[PDB]
């Protein structure tokens, strides 16, 4: 008698002066909003049920209706921004924060879930949730000696919701809120459950996405080693976010980058640069491009770990977007590397795969490659080996493309082309 009710029947019951009738009707509403597909979220909102639901949240005397309305509001909140807005507009945020203290673990978990959807909408609601004081109660829910004593699903929801409070960049979460949350985050990152680890990595992933001061407060917490370890996980849902975090960290100062190198992250790249999941391969190559954009001694670490042949590998064959990140990694390498290091790169066979990419329909990758060729010749010019390099580029159809790009349209291109042709060739 609470299965597949019509919205009007639900309205009929919730409007009666009978708490039990309202309870059945609320549960019926929750079931519509929980059905496999096409939950009537808009119809429920129009019927003006949100205010009734929000008010039921504050009924301590009847915990069951607190749960049902919490679940209904959770699913409405999981919709579009307009739908989530409807829930917030009803005054659900503070009502939910009060439920976090509930003696019924399943009710506060529902509250944790709803707050998760509200904060997940974006910067504005995220910061509004924080202003209503949700962080302390949430963290208090985790203030226990051993995370393993908490129910599996309850922990997964808390972590996920915390990762949403760390999410979004315009603007980034409040600095003081991040500091509050981090210590707990550092602890969840050492929990054995793969979902908890994934969402913890995602959170760190969001916090490291921004200015170097942001990256600093995370690195300062000493998590780089743990992130490197998770980088070698067998579960793709863990490797993906962990790699994104490590990648973000190396977009910062050289010293922040040295932290990932010291933690031994380079030893996992032979695998990542040939990973089956194209995305993991794209992210990894992009990460490499930022490391080769560092100090000569860091470029040298890339060399010692034998990662150059892997870059040659990616540049030679891979998804186009991955190849583009490879180009960058090369142009950066050649731009800050020593003469001896640029020579090594050539000995690894970079010239041919680099020349072949010039046939690509993408003015950006072409400027990047033409650029690298320049840097390479510049190094050869320092050894009187320019001719020898000309041959190689001439031997593998290289010149037959620079001369081509010489008739290109983009000013930056034909110029760079025209130059290389006269300064080292014809």
């Amino acid at each position: 008698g609470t299965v597949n009710w019509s919205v009007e029947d639900i309205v009929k019951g919730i409007n009666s002066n009978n708490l039990e009738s309202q309870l059945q009707a609320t549960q019926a509403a929750r079931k519509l909003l929980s059905r496999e597909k096409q939950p009537p979220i808009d119809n429920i909102i129009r019927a003006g049920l949100i205010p009734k639901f929000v008010s039921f949240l504050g009924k301590t005397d009847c915990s069951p209706i607190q749960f049902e309305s919490a679940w209904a509001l959770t699913n409405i909140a999981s919709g579009t921004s307009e739908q989530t807005k409807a829930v917030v507009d009803g005054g659900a945020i503070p009502a939910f924060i009060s439920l976090l203290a509930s003696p019924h673990a399943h009710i506060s978990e529902q509250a944790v879930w709803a707050l998760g959807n509200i904060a997940g909408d974006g910067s504005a609601f995220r910061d509004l949730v924080i202003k209503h004081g949700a962080i302390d109660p949430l963290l208090a829910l985790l203030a226990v000696p051993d995370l393993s004593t908490l129910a599996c699903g309850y922990l997964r929801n808390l972590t996920w919701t915390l990762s949403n409070l760390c999410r979004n960049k315009n603007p980034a979460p409040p600095l003081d809120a991040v500091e509050q949350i981090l210590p707990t985050l550092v602890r969840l990152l050492h929990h054995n459950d793969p979902e908890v680890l994934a969402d913890s990595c995602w959170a760190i992933s969001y916090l490291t996405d921004g200015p170097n001061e942001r990256i600093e407060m995370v690195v300062k917490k000493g998590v780089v080693p743990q992130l490197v370890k998770l980088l070698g996980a067998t579960e793709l849902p863990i490797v993906t976010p962990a790699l994104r975090a490590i990648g973000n960290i190396v977009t910062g100062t050289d010293e922040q980058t040295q932290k990932v190198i010291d933690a031994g992250a380079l030893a996992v790249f032979p695998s990542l640069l040939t990973n089956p999941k194209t995305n993991i391969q794209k992210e990894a190559t992009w990460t490499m491009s930022n490391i080769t954009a560092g100090r000569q001694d860091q470029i040298q670490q890339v060399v010692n770990h034998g990662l150059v042949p892997f870059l040659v590998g990616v540049l030679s064959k891979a998804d186009f977007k991955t190849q583009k990140e490879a180009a960058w990694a090369i142009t950066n390498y050649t731009s800050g590397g020593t003469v001896e290091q640029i020579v090594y790169l050539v000995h690894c066979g970079i010239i041919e795969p680099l020349m072949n990419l010039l046939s690509a329909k993408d003015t950006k990758i072409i400027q990047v490659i033409l650029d690298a060729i320049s840097n390479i010749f510049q190094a050869a010019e320092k050894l009187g080996e320019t001719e020898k390099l000309s041959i190689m580029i001439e031997e593998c159809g290289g010149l037959d493309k620079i001369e081509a790009l010489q008739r290109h349209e983009n000013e930056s291109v034909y110029k760079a082309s025209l130059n290389l042709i006269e300064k080292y060739f014809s």
Binding site: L33, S34, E36, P39, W71, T74, N75, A77, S78, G79, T84, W113, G116, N117, G120, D121, W160, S163, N164, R167, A198, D199, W202, S205, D209, T240, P241, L243, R244, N248, V250, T251, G252, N279, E283, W286, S289, N290, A293, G294, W328, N332, S335, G336
Partner: peptide, 21 residues
């Protein structure tokens, strides 16, 4: 400016919201 920050952020991003089935 050697370092290149994030683009489209495409490990995509975990679903921002979850419906309780």
């Amino acid at each position: 400016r050697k370092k290149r920050k994030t683009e489209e952020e495409s490990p995509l991003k975990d679903k921002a919201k979850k419906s309780k089935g």
